[PDB]
Structure formats: C-alpha cells, structure tokens
Amino acid sequence: GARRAAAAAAAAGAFAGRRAACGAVLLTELLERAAFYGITSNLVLFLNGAPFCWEGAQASEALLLFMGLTYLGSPFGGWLADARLGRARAILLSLALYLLGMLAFPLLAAPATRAALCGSARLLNCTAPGPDAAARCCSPATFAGLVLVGLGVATVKANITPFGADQVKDRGPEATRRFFNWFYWSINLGAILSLGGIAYIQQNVSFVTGYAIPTVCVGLAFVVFLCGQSVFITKPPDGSAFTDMFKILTYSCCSQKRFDSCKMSHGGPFTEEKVEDVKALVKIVPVFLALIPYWTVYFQMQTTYVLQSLHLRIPEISNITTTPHTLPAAWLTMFDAVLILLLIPLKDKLVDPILRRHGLLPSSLKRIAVGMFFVMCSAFAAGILESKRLNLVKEKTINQTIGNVVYHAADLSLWWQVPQYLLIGISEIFASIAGLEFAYSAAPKSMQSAIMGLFFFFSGVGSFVGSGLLALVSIKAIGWMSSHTDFGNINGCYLNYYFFLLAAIQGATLLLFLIISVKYDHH
Amino acid sequence: GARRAAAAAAAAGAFAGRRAACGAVLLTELLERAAFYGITSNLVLFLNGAPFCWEGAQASEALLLFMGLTYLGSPFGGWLADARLGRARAILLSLALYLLGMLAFPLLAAPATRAALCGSARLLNCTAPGPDAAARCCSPATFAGLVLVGLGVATVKANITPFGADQVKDRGPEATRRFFNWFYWSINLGAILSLGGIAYIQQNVSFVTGYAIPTVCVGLAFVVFLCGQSVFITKPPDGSAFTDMFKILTYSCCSQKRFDSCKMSHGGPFTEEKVEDVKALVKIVPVFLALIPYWTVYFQMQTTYVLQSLHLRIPEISNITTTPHTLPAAWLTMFDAVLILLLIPLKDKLVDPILRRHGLLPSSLKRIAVGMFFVMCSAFAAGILESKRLNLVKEKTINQTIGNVVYHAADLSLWWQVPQYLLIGISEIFASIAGLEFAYSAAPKSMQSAIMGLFFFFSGVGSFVGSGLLALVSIKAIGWMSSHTDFGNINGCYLNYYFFLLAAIQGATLLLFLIISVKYDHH
Ligand SMILES: CCCCCCCCCCCCCCCCCC(=O)O[C@@H](COC(=O)CCCCCCCCCCCCCCC)COP(=O)(O)OC[C@H](O)CO
Ligand SMILES: CCCCCCCCCCCCCCCCCC(=O)O[C@@H](COC(=O)CCCCCCCCCCCCCCC)COP(=O)(O)OC[C@H](O)CO
Ligand SMILES: CC(C)CCC[C@@H](C)[C@H]1CC[C@H]2[C@@H]3CC=C4C[C@@H](OC(=O)CCC(=O)O)CC[C@]4(C)[C@H]3CC[C@]12C
Ligand SMILES: CC(C)CCC[C@@H](C)[C@H]1CC[C@H]2[C@@H]3CC=C4C[C@@H](OC(=O)CCC(=O)O)CC[C@]4(C)[C@H]3CC[C@]12C
Ligand SMILES: CC(C)CCC[C@@H](C)[C@H]1CC[C@H]2[C@@H]3CC=C4C[C@@H](OC(=O)CCC(=O)O)CC[C@]4(C)[C@H]3CC[C@]12C
Ligand SMILES: CC(C)CCC[C@@H](C)[C@H]1CC[C@H]2[C@@H]3CC=C4C[C@@H](OC(=O)CCC(=O)O)CC[C@]4(C)[C@H]3CC[C@]12C
Ligand SMILES: CC(C)CCC[C@@H](C)[C@H]1CC[C@H]2[C@@H]3CC=C4C[C@@H](OC(=O)CCC(=O)O)CC[C@]4(C)[C@H]3CC[C@]12C
Ligand SMILES: CC(C)CCC[C@@H](C)[C@H]1CC[C@H]2[C@@H]3CC=C4C[C@@H](OC(=O)CCC(=O)O)CC[C@]4(C)[C@H]3CC[C@]12C
Ligand SMILES: CC(C)CCC[C@@H](C)[C@H]1CC[C@H]2[C@@H]3CC=C4C[C@@H](OC(=O)CCC(=O)O)CC[C@]4(C)[C@H]3CC[C@]12C
Ligand SMILES: CC(C)CCC[C@@H](C)[C@H]1CC[C@H]2[C@@H]3CC=C4C[C@@H](OC(=O)CCC(=O)O)CC[C@]4(C)[C@H]3CC[C@]12C
Ligand SMILES: CC(C)CCC[C@@H](C)[C@H]1CC[C@H]2[C@@H]3CC=C4C[C@@H](OC(=O)CCC(=O)O)CC[C@]4(C)[C@H]3CC[C@]12C
Ligand SMILES: CC(C)CCC[C@@H](C)[C@H]1CC[C@H]2[C@@H]3CC=C4C[C@@H](OC(=O)CCC(=O)O)CC[C@]4(C)[C@H]3CC[C@]12C
Ligand SMILES: CC(C)CCC[C@@H](C)[C@H]1CC[C@H]2[C@@H]3CC=C4C[C@@H](OC(=O)CCC(=O)O)CC[C@]4(C)[C@H]3CC[C@]12C
Ligand SMILES: CC(C)CCC[C@@H](C)[C@H]1CC[C@H]2[C@@H]3CC=C4C[C@@H](OC(=O)CCC(=O)O)CC[C@]4(C)[C@H]3CC[C@]12C
Ligand SMILES: *[C@@H]1O[C@H](CO)[C@@H](O)[C@H](O)[C@H]1NC(C)=O
Ligand SMILES: *[C@@H]1O[C@H](CO)[C@@H](O)[C@H](O)[C@H]1NC(C)=O
C-alpha cells in the first residue's frame, strides 16, 4: 500500500518541465478533430443540396467509402511512420496532405471556383426542370479531395497518439494514463467546438464560409506542430532501423511457411528481441478480435440514439431567443461529447487517485470490461425508454421540424434520454482510454504506430459489421426496421427490440472479453 | 497449468471409500427439506380453511413469524452445536424436536384429535352463520408446534451443512465443492418431491393424509441419520473445548471495552490462534453485510415471479388427462427447482472441469459476482416481459382459475417466462454454492457452525428487508402496487417498474460486492 504513495509523485509529477510539448500535441489533436468533424458533419447534405445534385444513396455511399478509407489507411500509415521515416516527419507529411486535399471543398462551395472546376458547370438545381440528368458530378475533384483527406486523417490518427504518449514516457504508466485522459478530453473539446459552431454556420450562414473554417483549423494545426518540432525533442524514434523489424516479422512468418516460433527462432538468426516482439503481436491480435463486437455495438448505439432523439420533444421553447431557423442536426451528436467533457476532469482528478489509493484497478483490461458492462446497462435503459415512447406514440402526434424535414415525435421531453448518455459517457471514459493505453503499452517499442493502426482498423471493421447488422434486421422477414427508407419514421418500426439485441450482444461480449483478458495476463 | 492435472485426482477421487456417509447426509437433507416445504407450502390455506377459521392477515403473520424464527435460531443453533455438544448430537436433538413439534399438525387435521385438542371445539365453518367470533383459535398448540419446528429447522440448517462438508475435508476444496454441488442438488430434489406430491395430495386429497407424509419424512430422516452415526466417524469435532473459544471472543472484545486486537492480544493471554480467529470473524462480517442486498433481491424476485406467472395463460390444455380439480399453486415455485435439477449435473460434470482446466475461477467470491450479474440480467428480462404483458392486458381478458380463485390473465403463454427462470437457475448454481463454500472455508476451524448460522441469519435479514421494500413501494404516493390487497390483481398495478428497480439494486450491489471481494483477498 505504501508503494502507491511512492507512485503518487509520478502522477502529479508527470507534467514535469515538459508541458509545452504536451500542450502542442493536444492543440494539434483538437484542431484536427475539429476539421474532421466539420467535414463529416453535413457532407451528405452538402452534396445533395449542391448544384451537383447527387442522389441520397450516392452521397451516403460517398461518406461510407470515405470513412472506410479512414479506417483502412491507418495500419499503412503506421507502417509508413515506423519505416523509412520518423514519427514527426510522418505527422507533418500527413497533415500537409490533409490540408491539400481538404482545400478543395471550399473552392467547390465558391460559385466562381465551382464553375472553374469540374469542367461541367452543373447547375441543374436539383428539382428545377432538367432534360434528363447525369451521374455524380464533379466526381474527379471531389473523389480526389476525399481520398487525400481520408488518407491524411488515417495517418495522423495512427501516428499522433503514440507520439504524444511516448513524449512523457520518461515517467510511468500513471503519467501515460494522465496524458491519455487529457488527450481524449481535447478530442472531445474539438468535437464539441466543430459540431456546434461549424455546423451552425454551415446550416445557417453559408457553406462557402462554413467549409473555409476547417481549412484554417488544419492550417493552424500544421503551423503549431511545425513550430513545436523544434522544442519537442521528445526522444524522437527516428525510425530508420525500424525498417528491419518489419521485414523480420515475415521471416518469423517464414518459419511458419518453412511456442513453435520461439523454438526455431533461438537456433536461427532470430535474435530473441524479434522473437519477443512477434510473440507479443500474436498475443495482442486476439484482444482486438475480441473487442470487435464492442466496436460494433458502440457505433451502432451511437448512430441509433440520434434517430431516437429526433422523435422526442425538442425543448427550450425551441430556442425562443434568436429563433433557430433550421435547427442543426449536430448538437444531438454533441450531447455525448458534452457529457464526456464534464466527466473526464472529475475522473482524472478524483476517481483515479482514489482507486490507486488502496489497491484497485491497476490494469486496462479490467477497465475495458467495466466500460462494456456500463454499455450494456445503457442499452437496456435505451430499450426501456424507446418501449415507453412506442406505447406513447399511439396517441396524438406533434409535427416538429429539424433541418427542413417534418419529423413526427411523441409528447415526451428529450431530457428523458439523459441516463442513457450518462452511462455512455462513463463507459467511454473507462473503455476508450483504457484501450488506447493498452494498445500503446503492449506493443513492442519498435512498431507502436503499427499496432495503433491495427487497433483503429479493427474499430472500423466493427463499425462496418454493425452497419451490416442494421441492414440485416431491416429485412421484411424480421420487420424491425421496415419503414426506415428515408431520414426516418421510426414511429412505424420497433427500434426497442434492437436496443435489447445490442444489450445481449454486448452482454455476451463482456463474458468473452473477460476470458481472453484473463488468459492474456497469465501469459 | 500442470498442477491443475495434479488436482484432477482430488476432484474425481473426492468420493473415496467413504461414499456411504455422504449418501446418508444427502438423504437426511432431502427428507428434511421435503418436510419443511410440505409444511410451508399451504400453511396459510390450511389455517384459513381449517375449522379454526383465522383471518388472512392472521395466517400471513403466523407464517412470517415462523420463517423469521427459522432465520433467527440459526446462529444460536450453531452456538449450541459448537459448545456443550458435538455436531452429530446437535443434529440428532434438533431433528428430534423437529419431529415432535411437527407431529401436532396432522392431529389438528384429524377431526377427532382436533376436537380433543385446543379445548375449544371451534367448528364455526368460516362463512357459516355464527354469533360473533373469537380470535385465532387453537393458538397454544399451533404456536407451540410452530416454534418447535422452526427452532428445529434452524438448528439443522445451521449444523448439517458444515457437518457434511467436513466429512470429505480429508481431500481438497475441489472435493468440498463437489460435495456442495451435490448437496444443493439433493436440496432441490427434495423441494421438487415435496412441492409436487405433497402439495397435490393436500390441495386435492385431504390435509389429514397430506400432513401425515412430512411427519414420516422427518421420521425417516431421524432414523437414517441415527443409523449412519455408527459409520460416520467423520472426524467428529466432539466440541467440548470449543466452549472456550466462544468465551474468548468476548475477551478479545473485552480488550475493545478495556490491527488493534492483534497488538494487545500478543502481549496478553490471547495465544495467537484466538487472535487469528477473531481477526477472521471481523474480516468475514463485512462480506455477509455486502451480500444482504443480494438476498433481498433474490427473495423478492422469487416471490414476485409467482404472481407474474399467475396472470399468464396456463398451458397444457389445463392438464386435459386427469383434469386438475384445483390446480395446485406450488408447481409455479417448483419451476425453478426443476431448472436447477437439470443444471447442476451439467455444471458439476462439464463446466467445473473445463474451468479448472486452464486457469479460470479458483475463488468463490468471483462466482458470487457472476451469479449476481446473471440475477441482474434475469431481472431486466422479467421487466421487459411484464411490460409486454401489461400492454397486452388492455385488450380482452381470460378468466382462468387456480386454487379456487378466479384470476385474470392475458392471452400470453406461461412458457414465455422460461428465460427468466433459466438465468435465475444459472445465477443460483453459481452464487448459492459459492456462498456456502465460502462460509465453510473462511470460518475458523473451531466455530464453523456459528458462521453458517450467521450466514443464514443475514439471509433472513435480507428477506425481511425485501418484504419491507415491497410494502414501501405499495404506498399510494408511489402507486406501483395499489390494488394488491388480495391474492393478486397485478393487472391494475405496474409490476414491471418493480423488476427494473430490483435490477438497479442488484446492479449497484455487484459493484459494491466486487470492491469488498477485492479487499478481502488482499488481506
Ligand atoms: C458468431 C456470430 C453469430 C451471429 C451474431 C449476429 C447476431 C445474431 C442474432 C440475430 C437476431 C435476429 C432476430 C432475432 C432472432 C429471432 C428471429 C426474430 O426476429 O423473430 C421475429 C419473427 O420473425 C421470424 O420468425 C422470421 C425468421 C427469419 C429467419 C432469420 C432470423 C433467425 C436468426 C438468423 C440469424 C442466426 C441467429 C442465431 C442465434 C444467435 C420477431 O419479430 P416479430 O414478427 O414478432 O416483430 C413484431 C411484429 O410482430 C412484427 O412482425
Ligand atoms: C442505502 C439505502 C438507500 C435506499 C435503498 C432502498 C431503495 C431506494 C430506491 C427507492 C425508489 C422509490 C421509487 C422511485 C424513486 C422516484 C419516485 C417514484 O417512484 O416516482 C413516481 C412518482 O411519484 C412521486 O413523485 C411521489 C414521490 C414520493 C416520495 C417518496 C419516493 C422518493 C424516494 C424515497 C426513497 C429515497 C430514494 C433515494 C434514491 C436512491 C413514479 O411513478 P408514477 O406515478 O409515474 O407511476 C406511473 C403512474 O403515473 C402511476 O402514478
Ligand atoms: C458479433 C459477430 C459479428 C461476431 C464477431 C466475430 C467473433 C465471432 C469473434 C470476435 C472475437 C473472436 C475470438 C478472439 C480470439 C480467439 C482466440 C483464438 O485462439 C488463439 O489463442 C489463437 C492462437 C491459436 O490458434 O492457438 C481462437 C479464436 C478466438 C476464440 C476468436 C473466435 C471468434 C471471435 C469470437
Ligand atoms: C451501477 C448501478 C447504477 C446499476 C447499473 C444499472 C443501472 C444504471 C440501470 C438499472 C435500471 C435502469 C433504469 C431502468 C428504467 C429507466 C426509466 C427510463 O425512463 C423511461 O423509460 C420513462 C421516463 C418517463 O417518461 O418518466 C429511463 C432510464 C431508466 C432510469 C434506467 C437507467 C439505468 C438504470 C438505473
Ligand atoms: C440527472 C439524472 C441523474 C436524473 C435522471 C435524468 C433526468 C434528466 C430526468 C429525471 C426527471 C426528469 C423530468 C421529470 C418529468 C418531466 C415531465 C415531462 O413531461 C411530460 O411527460 C409531458 C410532456 C408535455 O405535456 O409537455 C417532461 C420532462 C420532465 C421535465 C423530465 C426531464 C428529465 C428529468 C429531469
Ligand atoms: C473479408 C471477410 C473476412 C469478412 C470481413 C470483412 C468485413 C469488412 C465485411 C464483412 C461484412 C461486411 C458488411 C456486410 C453488409 C454491408 C451492408 C451494406 O449496406 C448497403 O449497401 C445496403 C444499405 C444501404 O444502401 O445503405 C454496406 C456494406 C456492409 C456494411 C459490409 C461492409 C464490409 C463488411 C463488414
Ligand atoms: C445472445 C444473443 C446473440 C441472442 C439473443 C438476442 C435476443 C435479445 C433476441 C433473440 C430473439 C429475440 C426475440 C424474438 C421474438 C420476439 C417476438 C416479438 O414480437 C412479439 O412480441 C410477437 C411474437 C409472436 O407473435 O410470436 C417481440 C420481441 C421478441 C421477444 C424478440 C426480442 C429480442 C430477442 C429475445
Ligand atoms: C450472457 C449473455 C446471454 C448476455 C446476458 C444478458 C442476456 C441473457 C439478456 C440480454 C437481452 C435479454 C432478452 C431481452 C428481451 C427478451 C424478450 C422477453 O419476451 C418478451 O418480452 C415477449 C416474448 C414474446 O411473447 O415473444 C423474454 C426475455 C428476453 C428474451 C430477454 C432474455 C435475456 C436476454 C437475452
Ligand atoms: C451454466 C451454463 C448453461 C452456462 C454456459 C456458459 C458458461 C460456460 C459461462 C457463463 C458465464 C461465464 C463466465 C463469465 C466470466 C468469467 C470471469 C473470468 O474470471 C476471472 O478470471 C476474472 C478475473 C480474476 O479472477 O482475477 C473467467 C471466465 C468466466 C468465469 C466465464 C467462464 C464461462 C462462463 C461460466
Ligand atoms: C439495500 C438497502 C436496504 C441497504 C442495505 C444495507 C447497506 C447500506 C449495507 C450492505 C453492505 C454494507 C457495507 C458492508 C461493509 C462495509 C465495510 C465497513 O468497513 C470496514 O471494513 C469495517 C471495519 C472498520 O470500521 O474499519 C464500512 C461499512 C461498509 C462499507 C458497509 C456499509 C453499508 C452497506 C452498504
Ligand atoms: C428455450 C430457450 C433457450 C428459448 C427461449 C424460451 C422459449 C421457451 C420460448 C421461445 C419461443 C417461444 C414460443 C414462441 C411462440 C409462441 C406463441 C404464443 O402464442 C401467442 O402469443 C398467442 C396466444 C394464443 O392466442 O393462444 C404461445 C407461446 C409460444 C408457443 C412460445 C412458447 C415459449 C417459447 C418456446
Ligand atoms: C434493528 C435495526 C438495525 C434494523 C434492522 C432490523 C431488520 C430485521 C428490520 C429493518 C426493517 C424491518 C422491516 C420493515 C417493515 C416491514 C413490513 C411489515 O409488513 C407489514 O406488516 C405490512 C404488510 C402486511 O400486512 O403484510 C413486515 C415486517 C417488515 C418486513 C420489517 C421486518 C424487520 C426489518 C427487516
Ligand atoms: C440505483 C438505484 C438505487 C436507484 C435507481 C432506481 C431506478 C430503477 C428507478 C428510480 C426512479 C425510477 C423512475 C421514476 C419515475 C418514473 C415515471 C413512471 O411513470 C411514468 O412513466 C410517468 C411519469 C410522469 O408522469 O412524470 C415510469 C417509471 C419511472 C421512469 C421510474 C422507473 C424506475 C426508476 C428509474
Ligand atoms: C464516473 C463516476 C460518475 C462513477 C462513480 C462511481 C465509481 C466510483 C464506480 C463505478 C464503477 C465502479 C467499479 C466497479 C467494479 C470494480 C471492479 C474491482 O476490480 C477488481 O479488483 C476486480 C478483480 C481484479 O482486478 O482482479 C474494483 C472496484 C471497481 C473498479 C469499481 C470502482 C468504483 C467504480 C469505478
Ligand atoms: C438555382 O438557380 C439560381 C437562379 O438562377 C442560382 O442562383 C442558383 O445558384 C441555382 N442553385 C444551385 C444549387 O445551383
Ligand atoms: C362444516 O359443517 C359440516 C357439516 O356439519 C362439518 O362436517 C364440517 O366439518 C364443518 N367444517 C369445518 C371446516 O369445520
């Protein structure tokens, strides 16, 4: 117990005379998240309403492919960072590409540059009379910008977090944990700023001035990272010999094609360090595989709660002061970010010291398990609430309005959703931070970026699997989501059952995760 | 991992050339449980319908006081067993009083002996015309039999289980665990036999022949235990010096009135053995305190599920073959016993070897936690089911009939309750057995009976607290249970919310229990 007090110095003393570097990293993360959320917030609406009037399916497919690219590039971004480059040079290059690609969107917004580009001058004005129509317009430039921005975001997301973490590695895992809590805090702050401001301006001032701001944010991110480069000196990996380790992994896998790995490696030219790293990689892959369902349910719940909310009473006299023409459809997502913003400081300053006081959770795996339990509880809460709403819709209905679509909602206040999102926030502040800490901590010192990329790739796989599941339950045979052929008319569909299904899926996952967690520590 | 295979001999080899003693103990346990459940199954109905027509409140109060006495006597029964007597002699004496007291009821059933006793000859026939009426009749004899039987059951329940466990103590905790699995199996088998057979005979043949059988069961229990006494020789504690240990606990508590206990004890005449036992007692008391809410929710769910079932469609063509005049109201309780009967063999023969194979749960506390999680899941399932039933009652209703009361039920098959009871059974086969194993294992070798009695007393405390809670939510101000002024009309009350409340109470308990469990192992 007394040794815990000895470690108390590291916790408070983590941010020793090096706070500037950590601040720079956090600021860069904030700016990049703000830009990313600004891009993804209303991309569908921008495409649909733009003079290049695509079909809703086309825009949805574009966004889905963009997100998939963001998930896919991450392991490759980590490979690039750890091989043939350093980490910092990788961040700089990725952010340069990020800015270059994202630049395109505001030009497309500006009518003069819009006409100058695409060599099409497509101004069919959607519903305006037109002699037939073409397919997705402005395809070359739009796709090019999308691929550039997606690759940039994937590479930065894979490379920055281990870069920041290894910054304070001089201290202990307690210091790393504190850094990670504040990292997630900054991420959420950027998400809030973007989703609130930029969405308000885009949906209520203009796209031309709306898409301009994210470009500025990414530019400032570039400048701040570049300036901090001089004072970082954060034990830069300078990965040039790291190139060798990546090729050796194949050589270890060559033995498979040619503790089985350990026995053959010792005799051959497989000096023990590489054997240990490959063994670690094998050990960790199962853990991400086991987290896949957690990502599935997480992303599915995140998507579903928004449609649930859209059909509850919108409060606050509909913002009587400064009447909200076209109330933006992003603050609904921002709710969870608000809750995490409130929670994280309390956690970091009170709970973690308390738990570390006596003997409590010293490992991240247990924290992920706790988060999963909280997710399950939240899913049940949401199911119950949606059940009551469904019984409450059979009576009269109120014609509310969000964006420019006349939703149908029940006479139930949106605040009733508070317990769900609260449990979600608790689950996130446990799980997400524990998972990032685990990914950084377990990976061999040579290829941390690669393992972080793999982590994010598996998260993307889970998101895609969840989307597939949502499509599956929509089949007529099941009939849970049959009238969901548009923005949404959940009133006619049984979403409550879906929440319970997620709870079951999450519940089973927790038990499965516990088994693997136990096995991992033993070995 | 290989040491697990070494322990495999104990698991299979637990029942070495000593199977006769364990068989005798299990048979005695089965007979005693059968008698106890036969007594408690329709005591209220027997009193209300007997020529000594009490009021429903009077009979309910009588049963409640009887159960409370059963819970209260347990620590005192353990004290008696461990001091001034041995365990076997305590069992014999307790069963003798058990039989003596229980004998009364069949005489009261027999009209000739009924008239001979009570010196009252109360034959007012309930609804038959009567010039006024008196209070609870046959009070002296009925109360005397009830107190005798309650004290007997408390003492046997406290004394037998550690007696059986220490029988196979030559082997390891794996052997003890196997014994406890089969102990619970026998308990459930006896419960099934009683609740089915004896309840059918009582409610469908006659009380005179119905209450005779439990007397026979307790008599055979006495005889089998007496006969096995010769071959038991199960390292009988022969507690005569154990008397000293109990008085010293006060002396350790005298230091409090005169590791604080350890420091003063070493210097004084408090040889370290007693210091260790008192320290252990202090450590364990918190654990029972922490389990109190688990007992609360367990007993509350057990009671509530029956009323839930009573309003679902009664299946099986109402037992078309041999039409069930006055379908008994005990098989509804017997459902859970059936499920545990099916589960326990599978657990014992498959799951426990599998878990012990690699590295999995080696401690009972974790098993109790798992059971609690399963209870929470079952509570949520029941809440959802009751919610759907409540929405399904608003339409037409069906007048079924159980006992002789015209219940109102919804057009929903009773089988829908299967998942609830399945999860309950899983939770029981984990928790209950783990808890018995813990109580026996942690207690100092001198006073195991006392700690088992304390365990059962805390279980009773939890049951009483749960009853108080159910009364509480019935208040008009809350209105969840307002029309429940009789056998039950939950159709007009919101039972579903109550199930969720238990889930929350259970959910919080699990987190609390985990903290204490962790602290216990550390110390
Ligand atoms: C290792 C990976 C395993 C798979 C993991 C993915 C998720 C598995 C769970 C998927 C659950 C599917 C839906 C629930 C299972 C029962 C089928 C069902 O939904 O029953 C409906 C009844 O539908 C049917 O009977 C149609 C059956 C279609 C066949 C496909 C579904 C069966 C399951 C297929 C997947 C396999 C799952 C195995 C169990 C894990 C009930 O809806 P309802 O009609 O009562 O709705 C209310 C109202 O009346 C509107 O209709
Ligand atoms: C360390 C020990 C702590 C205590 C542990 C015991 C259990 C604690 C939890 C007890 C829960 C009580 C009921 C739920 C709390 C909110 C009050 C409530 O039930 O609200 C009702 C509304 O009732 C009220 O507003 C009356 C309030 C009465 C005051 C007493 C209840 C408050 C809580 C008292 C106990 C303290 C609990 C603190 C929280 C843990 C809702 O029912 P309804 O009227 O909407 O029902 C449907 C239909 O409309 C029929 O009416
Ligand atoms: C939610 C739906 C869409 C399913 C999602 C995929 C699951 C079926 C995956 C997720 C986690 C996976 C498990 C993760 C880890 C392992 C350990 C693995 O065994 C090892 O230790 C690998 C090395 C060896 O072969 O010895 C065997 C497969 C298994 C149980 C996996 C089986 C398949 C699981 C359950
Ligand atoms: C760690 C502890 C808190 C246990 C873990 C589980 C709890 C967080 C769960 C158990 C029961 C759940 C509750 C069950 C039912 C409801 C009612 C539900 O509200 C409605 O459906 C209607 C509201 C109205 O209009 O009055 C909101 C969620 C809530 C509070 C749930 C919130 C989450 C709770 C407390
Ligand atoms: C903050 C956490 C820890 C407590 C649980 C969540 C709260 C945010 C809930 C609990 C009580 C709820 C309130 C209780 C009662 C109502 C009445 C409710 O009105 C109706 O049901 C009728 C609607 C109409 O006619 O306008 C509107 C929401 C409101 C204020 C609820 C808003 C959300 C509250 C504050
Ligand atoms: C390669 C093997 C080992 C399988 C694992 C690869 C995954 C990346 C696959 C498996 C299932 C796939 C999903 C199956 C079904 C769909 C539904 C599909 O949705 C639609 O196009 C219909 C609805 C709409 O139009 O929006 C979108 C792709 C998605 C999520 C797929 C994305 C890619 C997934 C997750
Ligand atoms: C552990 C995981 C992988 C499997 C368990 C997932 C459950 C949450 C699913 C599986 C089957 C589902 C049930 C299948 C059928 C129905 C009937 C459905 O409609 C009715 O009530 C009428 C049905 C009829 O008319 O027969 C209501 C939901 C319910 C109970 C579903 C609720 C959600 C359940 C329990
Ligand atoms: C270890 C795994 C299985 C996760 C732990 C939790 C599960 C056991 C829970 C999650 C969701 C629950 C289900 C949610 C909803 C339902 C529907 C419910 O039935 C109804 O509401 C109506 C049934 C009908 O008439 O169709 C019966 C319980 C059940 C299957 C529940 C059973 C228990 C489940 C599977
Ligand atoms: C009774 C039958 C029908 C259930 C079939 C499924 C079982 C095989 C599952 C249900 C719950 C599972 C358990 C859920 C959680 C855990 C916790 C985990 O225990 C730990 O080691 C926790 C950490 C520690 O002990 O320090 C090991 C796996 C285990 C026991 C699981 C083992 C497999 C179990 C028993
Ligand atoms: C469900 C409702 C009716 C409440 C039921 C009673 C609870 C309030 C009890 C059950 C478990 C109890 C806890 C069990 C054990 C302890 C440890 C105890 O601290 C010790 O270790 C005692 C020795 C010391 O004083 O140092 C302090 C009280 C506490 C937290 C208890 C506080 C009160 C609790 C939560
Ligand atoms: C065994 C476990 C692992 C699976 C889940 C629990 C089962 C016991 C459930 C699942 C499907 C259920 C059946 C699905 C559909 C129905 C129709 C249902 O009929 C109605 O809802 C209408 C009633 C009428 O009109 O008579 C009667 C119950 C029954 C047979 C259910 C009985 C209970 C079943 C077998
Ligand atoms: C002594 C101090 C430390 C409190 C702990 C002692 C417990 C044994 C007490 C606390 C609350 C009591 C309960 C509070 C309220 C009631 C309701 C009461 O029910 C009625 O008489 C009304 C309903 C009916 O007539 O059936 C029965 C006793 C009971 C369960 C009590 C039984 C004894 C309890 C559990
Ligand atoms: C962790 C433990 C100790 C506390 C949490 C227990 C919950 C399961 C309780 C506390 C408050 C309860 C809620 C209080 C009020 C209501 C309103 C009640 O009635 C209505 O739907 C109308 C209410 C209105 O008109 O305002 C429905 C159940 C609900 C949500 C209750 C469901 C069960 C809740 C969430
Ligand atoms: C974020 C705020 C608003 C939540 C306030 C309540 C917390 C203080 C609770 C919520 C969940 C609780 C946890 C639930 C379960 C556990 C498991 C337990 O961990 C173990 O030691 C498990 C066994 C092992 O590690 O081997 C220690 C207590 C802990 C972390 C609890 C500590 C207290 C926590 C964090
Ligand atoms: C629709 O036509 C108007 C008037 O000609 C023009 O100003 C506007 O840009 C067109 N809209 C789009 C989306 O191209
Ligand atoms: C009611 O009266 C009948 C006929 O006199 C008698 O046989 C019966 O025992 C009485 N019932 C009771 C419960 O005493």
UniProtKB/Swiss-Prot annotation, chains A, B:
Catalysed reaction, written as an equation: glycylglycylglycine(out) + n H(+)(out) = glycylglycylglycine(in) + n H(+)(in); N-acetyl-D-muramoyl-L-alanyl-D-isoglutamine(out) + n H(+)(out) = N-acetyl-D-muramoyl-L-alanyl-D-isoglutamine(in) + n H(+)(in); L-alanyl-gamma-D-glutamyl-meso-2,6-diaminopimelate(out) + n H(+)(out) = L-alanyl-gamma-D-glutamyl-meso-2,6-diaminopimelate(in) + n H(+)(in); carnosine(out) + n H(+)(out) = carnosine(in) + n H(+)(in)
**What InterPro entries would the database entry show?**
MFS_trans_sf, POT_fam, PTR2_symporter_CS
Q: Name one GO molecular function term.
A: L-histidine transmembrane transporter activity
Q: What residues form the membrane-spanning segments?
A: 34-54, 61-81, 90-110, 143-163, 179-199, 207-227, 281-301, 326-346, 368-388, 422-442, 453-473, 498-518
The annotated consequence of residue 32 to A reads:
Does not affect interaction with TASL
Q: Which UniProt keywords apply?
A: Endosome, Immunity, Innate immunity, Lysosome, Membrane, Peptide transport, Phosphoprotein, Protein transport, Symport, Transmembrane, Transmembrane helix, Transport
Residues modified as Phosphoserine: 261
Coiled-coil boundaries: none
Q: What Pfam families does UniProt report for this protein, alphabetically? A: PTR2
Q: In which tissues is it expressed?
A: Highly expressed in skeletal muscle. Moderately expressed in kidney, liver, and heart. Weakly expressed in colon and brain. Expressed in low levels throughout the gastrointestinal tract and in Caco-2 cells. Expressed in retinal fragment epithelium (RPE) and neural retina. Expressed in small intestine, stomach, duodenum, jejunum, ileum and colon.
Q: Which PANTHER family match?
A: OLIGOPEPTIDE TRANSPORTER-RELATED
Task: Name the job this protein performs.
Answer: Proton-coupled amino-acid transporter that mediates the transmembrane transport of L-histidine and some di- and tripeptides from inside the lysosome to the cytosol, and plays a key role in innate immune response. Able to transport a variety of di- and tripeptides, including carnosine and some peptidoglycans. Transporter activity is pH-dependent and maximized in the acidic lysosomal environment.
Q: What is this protein called?
A: Solute carrier family 15 member 4
Species name for this entry?
Answer: Homo sapiens (Human)
Q: What is the lineage of its organism?
A: Eukaryota, Metazoa, Chordata, Craniata, Vertebrata
